[PDB]
Structure formats: structure tokens, C-alpha cells
Amino acid sequence: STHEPLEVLKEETVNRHRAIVSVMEELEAVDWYDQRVDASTDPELTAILAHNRDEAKEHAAMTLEWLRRNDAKWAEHLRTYLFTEGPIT
Amino acid sequence: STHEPLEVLKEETVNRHRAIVSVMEELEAVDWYDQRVDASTDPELTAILAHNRDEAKEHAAMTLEWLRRNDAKWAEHLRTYLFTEGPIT
Amino acid sequence: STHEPLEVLKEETVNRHRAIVSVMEELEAVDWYDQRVDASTDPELTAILAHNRDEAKEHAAMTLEWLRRNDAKWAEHLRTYLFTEGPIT
Amino acid sequence: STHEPLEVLKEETVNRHRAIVSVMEELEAVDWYDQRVDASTDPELTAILAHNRDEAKEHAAMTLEWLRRNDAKWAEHLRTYLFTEGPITA
Amino acid sequence: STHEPLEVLKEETVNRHRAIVSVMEELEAVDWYDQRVDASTDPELTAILAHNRDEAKEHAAMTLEWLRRNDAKWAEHLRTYLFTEGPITAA
Amino acid sequence: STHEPLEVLKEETVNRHRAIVSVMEELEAVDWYDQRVDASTDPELTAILAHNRDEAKEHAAMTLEWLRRNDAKWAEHLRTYLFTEGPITAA
Amino acid sequence: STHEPLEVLKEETVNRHRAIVSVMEELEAVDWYDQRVDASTDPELTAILAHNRDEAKEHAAMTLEWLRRNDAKWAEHLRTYLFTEGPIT
Amino acid sequence: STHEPLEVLKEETVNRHRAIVSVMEELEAVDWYDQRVDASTDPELTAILAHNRDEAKEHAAMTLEWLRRNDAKWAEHLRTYLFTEGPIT
Amino acid sequence: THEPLEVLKEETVNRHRAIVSVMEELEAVDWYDQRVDASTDPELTAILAHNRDEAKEHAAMTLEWLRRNDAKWAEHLRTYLFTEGPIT
Amino acid sequence: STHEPLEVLKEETVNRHRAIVSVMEELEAVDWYDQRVDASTDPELTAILAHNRDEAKEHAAMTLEWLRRNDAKWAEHLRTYLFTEGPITAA
Ligand SMILES: [Ca+2]
Ligand SMILES: [Ca+2]
Ligand SMILES: [Ca+2]
Ligand SMILES: [Ca+2]
Ligand SMILES: [Ca+2]
Ligand SMILES: [Ca+2]
Ligand SMILES: [Ca+2]
Ligand SMILES: [Ca+2]
Ligand SMILES: [Ca+2]
Ligand SMILES: [Ca+2]
């Protein structure tokens, strides 16, 4: 799944790759589920989709915390912006 | 770029979609630049890749804070896990 | 995301499409997470990956039950084969 | 077709991957056949498409049962939700 | 799924399109199932994969017959080569 | 092109893979050409596209006969459905 | 199949697009068949693959001639290079 | 980028593969550039797109000539159809 | 385009046409250069190398168009192109 | 991610591949961000998308300068066309 041969990648880079691709996939599921929630015409399906959507958000947050704890720039940049109140830029 | 027709999607669902795909694309850049930092045999190139990598993390962090502020479950789940101690699970 | 124009599709066919593609995406996550569990060299990440894997199984099971309740041949075939003993064929 | 190198995967993981990808592909045929069934304007084709659709559902059910027999969490989560009444999110 | 807009396609062209992509997908399943059958190390799964494989061949054959009945050049070319005996590049 | 590593695939499985992906690719061409035949506004091009469409049908037919000769379930199911009359799903 | 909306494309541009992608698809078949001919271990299959390879070349040549007749600079550049002797550059 | 293992491919097959994919990519650029030419509303951009378009045609023609010189059936079939009059089929 | 053309400004769409063109020429530059290294036929190698370097030229032309038509492209290309010393 | 085997590629070819795909990806982000900037109906998001858009341009320029320094034909052609006046096709 990597762009460079594993041969040249440090173990920490590959573990971070595993986490990053996990966040990406959960983010995608969040988005597609939210779209289906809006478009669904069956309320029983809509409740299932909306539930799965919100657990995908939890999966992403758990993996993002792992990245925060194992990558200094992630911790630094996440600390600057997350859980703030003023204008983001 | 959306999976359901825009006509059935709420405005704010589409704006969250724009933010989520942005975070996904910045996450992909972080992973790919990080792999290329490891594999590059040109130090001047490596310094550029590393700089771009870490700015992609900042772009992800800003856009993520926007998601947190505009989605009740992103705020709940991010609050649960980010900058915590002890087992993420 | 549909192969035929929404004008010619029954509303229920589109709802079933929303469910099928959700299950497919959950199955993909189960598989990918399980492969990352085997390959991970960080025990914390492995624990997150395994947790997300097993919740993806739950999401699939939930959505599959919706299909079962909303499609006569899913109900027939799932009842023939699930929770059985002896050769599946 | 695996995302991690086969050297690091347990044999059982790779066999479950084979089953999972099989279920995914049968589900996709189910969805596409059903959409084609709605859109077809040839009755003889529609009958073939609907026949193939419903056998794809059967292939998926067979492979899902194998997964249930070979994975404790699949067996648990399928047990909880399949063949129930009432809200699924309960 | 079509490469040209539906407005310019004849209805029968679109029906043949539906038949063709079905056959393609059944063929893809035949091939992947057979590879997984070779590679599987679990005999219970292998029996399932092989059963699904051969049912996919049936799905392809059924849809192929529909194409044969609804397209004269399919009928011509399938008649030239199927169920023959000699070298195939000569019939 | 294979979904499992070559070192676990039997040679005959890989040859059938080569034949199957060939039929799939010719089928794709038949469909795409036929759609372009409907949409084209230049008659000289249309005649070329149709010629190519129908030669793609022949390529698929030749390769299908190889499959029939090299796989007993292809032989069985194709014999059941090709060149028949009456409902296809009842043969 | 077009990258710009059909309503802004001239009709001649769309016909050339039909021809160009046909040549591309036939070129791909020539290449893929030639690789399979080299790799095949069944002589009866190989003869079929090679027959189809060389017909895909004929299809490409035919379609390219239509393009040549319908595009002034296809005609000019093909006339410059085809059927020459000496370094192509 | 080849479909069969390089170990079983003949040297000439791999070189023709490099030439064929090059012709394919130049043809694609001709088509996409021509579509952008029709749709562009900036005259300076349009001039660049058309200029690059006609050079991609020259690149394809050069590479096709190499194929003609290095493949007897390309030579036969191009000779049959290129620079002719009357019905191509 | 990733958003509907009806919500996009006309200049935005023209910059899209330019950006995707540069991207496709860059990809050709990269693929041609890899093929130049791997080619075992001398006349082919010369064609690939010629096509490679013309794609670079196409990219340069289309980038200049962007520079003339986007103030941030002009600023950032002015900051870094043709400089001495560390790029970061 | 290379199309030829790494064995046969010169090291500078692989490093230029790393630079080129980086530029492509930053360019893609410039384009997608700008289209999202046009289409966004939330001004706080728009400000983020637009800031990110303009930093992608800087990333592209930095990497392009590296290519210019490491490739004579990039240096030649960029010198011909960048920061000029008049018809671009003629300089
Ligand atoms: Ca605070
Ligand atoms: Ca990207
Ligand atoms: Ca996914
Ligand atoms: Ca499929
Ligand atoms: Ca056998
Ligand atoms: Ca094809
Ligand atoms: Ca023929
Ligand atoms: Ca391209
Ligand atoms: Ca125009
Ligand atoms: Ca030039």
C-alpha cells in the first residue's frame, strides 16, 4: 500500500502510515454516511447509517490521538488549533 | 464530487463534505511526503519534502478544528480522546 | 453513485443500494484493519486497529439485518445458511 | 490483493480476506443487477438479471456463514442482529 | 455507466450494454474465484469459492445466450467457433 | 494482473486468467464501440467503429471456445444455454 | 466520456475524441496481447492471442487513417515521419 | 507497468510497450487539449493549449514510426491504410 | 471539475484547464525520463528524450500563463524561482 | 510508484520523480481548493480553504525551483517563459 519500498521506510513511518490511512478511511465513511442519511427515504435505514457515521467519527478520533502521541508535529499543530474558540486562521 | 445528488443534500452536509475531503487529501500528503523523506537520497529535496509534510499537518489541524465546531459528534468524540492519558481504547 | 439514472430506479432499490454499499465499505474496513493488526509493530496502534475492526463487523451486521428485513431473497438465503452446522454447500 | 505483505499476515487472516473480498464482490453484483433489473426494457434480459441477482445473494450468504464459523466476533455480532425484530440500533 | 449520453443511444444498445457488463462481471468473478481456490488453505472455504465460481460461469453463459439472440453478429461469430473441433484460429 | 501471487497459482489457472481477461476486454470494446456507433455524426467513422465492434465480437468468440475446451464447467454451462429456444432461465 | 461539457465542444471535436479513444483502446490491446503471447504456456491460446493482437493493430491503423483525413496537423505530422529512413528525431 | 512479469517478456516486447504507452498518452493529450481549446474563454490560454496539442500529435507520429520500423505487422497494416483515398473499411 | 460549473467563476475554470495541463505534462516528463533510463533501443531512447524535454517546455509555458493570471502564483514563483541558497 | 524497475533507474531520475509527483499533487490541491473556495457557503471554511490553497502554490514553487536547479532542460525552459511579456508561445 506504500509509495516507496518498505525496504527503505523506517518502522515508525510505516506505523504512522497505518494510522493515517485509517483516519482517511473513517473520514470517508463519515462523509458518505452523512450523505446517505440526508438522501435516505427509509427512517430505519437512516438511523443505522447515522449511528455508523458517528462511530466512524470515534474511530477517527481514537486514531488521531495515537498520531498525536507518536508524532511531534501532529501534537504541535493539533495543540495549536483543536479545542479553541477564536478564528481558525 | 458527492455520492448523492446535491438536490437532496443539506447545505451544511456539503460544507462538511468539502472539509472532510480536504482533511483526507492533506492526510494523504503527510503520509506520502513522510515516505519520500525516508527514501529520498537528495538532502535539498528532502528538506523541501519535510517542510511540506509538516505544513500539510497544519492544514489538516485547522480544517479539523472547523469540523469540530460544526458537528456535535466530532466535538464529542474528539474531546473524549485528544490530549488524554492512558489507553485510547 | 448509481449505475442507472435515478429517474428509472424504484425508491426502494436506491435505499437497498445505500445499504449494500455501506456493508461493502464496512467489510473493506474489517479486512484492512485485520491486516494492519497482524503487521503493526506498535501495541497501542494494534489495539485501536483491532477495536475499529470489530466495530466494523458490528456495523456490517446491523446493515445486513436491514437488508434482510427489506429483501425477500436476502431473508431466504440468510436463513438457509447462517447459524448452521455441516457443509455449507 | 492484500495491503500488507503476505509475509506478515497469518494464514487465517489471508483466508478471511479471501472470504471478505468474495462477499464484497457478490454484494456489488447484487446492487448492480438490481439497478439493471429496474432499468431494463427487455423482459427476457430482466429475468436473467433477476435470477443472477438472487444467486449472488446466495453466494454472499454462504461465504458469510463461513466467516461466522471462523471468526468469533463475526459470530457474536451476526448473532446479536440477524433475525431480530424491533429497532436495529438497539 | 454509459460513455455516450443516453439521449443518443438506442434503447436496444443500452440493453445490450446491460447484458455485456453483466457478462464481464461474471467473468471477473470466475477468474478471481479460481485464483482464490488455488491459493486457499481452508478446504471449507475452497468448496464455497469453487461452487460460486462455477455458478458464475452459468450466469455468464445465460447472459451470453441473450446477446446471441439479440445481436446478429454475436450469433454469427459464436456459431463459427463454439462447439467446434479443429484449430480455433482457422474456423 | 493476478489477485493471488503467481507462486501459488497453477499454470493452467493463469492461462485461463489470460483468456478470461481477454474476453472481458473485447466485451468492453464491443459495448464502447456500439455506443460510439450510435452517437457518431460522421458516417465514415461510424463504419469503422462498426467494423471494429464486430471484430471484437469474433475475438471474444474464439477465446470463449478455448475456455470451453479447457474447463469442464464452461463446457457444461455453455452447452446448456447457447443456441437454444424458449426461456433462458428455464433450460 | 468527455472532460468538458458537450454543449461547449464542437461536433467535430467530439467525433475526433471518439476516434482517438478507439485508437488508444486498440493500442492497449496490442500491448496487452503481445505480453500475454510472450507469457502464455498454452500454444492454442497463444495463437488466438497473437491473432487478436495483429487485428488490433489493423483496427488502430484504420482509425488513425480516419483521424489523419479529418485533422490537418495529424495529416502533416504523420506525413513527416511515417515511412521514412534515418533518425526519426 | 507491464501486465506480465518482465522475466517472461522478450526485450522487444518491452520496448514496444514503452512506445505504445507513449503513443497512448500523447493521443490522450491531443484529445484533452482539443476539448480544452473549445471550452477555454481566455485567448492566451487557448493559444498555448492548441500549440501543445499539435506538438503532442507530432510526438505520437514520431513514436508510431518507430513502431512501424520495429514490428512487421504494424508496417503491413499502416502501409495498407495510411495515406489512402476511398472507403477505409 | 470537482464542484458544479454553475457555481464556479469563469476564471477559476480557466485556471483549472491550465493546472490540469501542467499536471499532465509533468506526468509525461516523469514517465518519459523513466523510460529513457530503461529503454534498450537507441532510436527509441532518442525519441523518448526528445518528447520528455518538450513536455517540460509545455509545462513551462502553461505555468507562465498561471503566473500572469494569479497573484499568489506570481508572488510565490517570484519568491523561489531562480534563487541561490536554501529553498527552505 | 515508478513505472520502470528501480534497478534500472538513475538515482537522480527517482529523486526527480519524487519532486514531480509532489508538484502534481500540490497543483491538484491548488485547483480543488480554489473550486471549493468558489463553491463554499461557509465563510470560515472558505478562509481555511483559501489559506491552504495559497500554501499549496508555495509548495509547488519551492519544489519546482529544486527541479530547475537539478535539470538543465527545466532550467532552460523555465528561463525562456517565466517572467516574460508578450505571446507565451513565441518567447
Ligand atoms: Ca477555551
Ligand atoms: Ca491528492
Ligand atoms: Ca473505503
Ligand atoms: Ca466486480
Ligand atoms: Ca484442471
Ligand atoms: Ca480496454
Ligand atoms: Ca477477424
Ligand atoms: Ca496522461
Ligand atoms: Ca469556445
Ligand atoms: Ca515546443
PDB file of C-alpha atoms and ligand atoms in Angstrom, chain H residues 24-26 28-29 32, chain I residues 23-25 27-28 31, ligand 8:
ATOM      1  CA  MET H  24      -1.435   6.359 -25.946  1.00  0.00           C
ATOM      2  CA  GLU H  25      -0.513   9.200 -23.587  1.00  0.00           C
ATOM      3  CA  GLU H  26       0.174  11.616 -26.469  1.00  0.00           C
ATOM      4  CA  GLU H  28      -4.874  11.378 -24.746  1.00  0.00           C
ATOM      5  CA  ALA H  29      -3.200  14.758 -24.552  1.00  0.00           C
ATOM      6  CA  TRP H  32      -7.906  16.594 -23.809  1.00  0.00           C
TER       7      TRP H  32
ATOM      8  CA  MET I  23      -0.048  18.193 -14.258  1.00  0.00           C
ATOM      9  CA  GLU I  24      -0.357  16.059 -17.354  1.00  0.00           C
ATOM     10  CA  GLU I  25       2.835  17.465 -18.873  1.00  0.00           C
ATOM     11  CA  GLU I  27       3.494  13.296 -15.571  1.00  0.00           C
ATOM     12  CA  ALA I  28       4.772  12.874 -19.110  1.00  0.00           C
ATOM     13  CA  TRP I  31       7.280   8.804 -17.323  1.00  0.00           C
TER      14      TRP I  31
HETATM   15 CA    CA K   8      -1.768  11.390 -19.117  1.00  0.00          CA
END
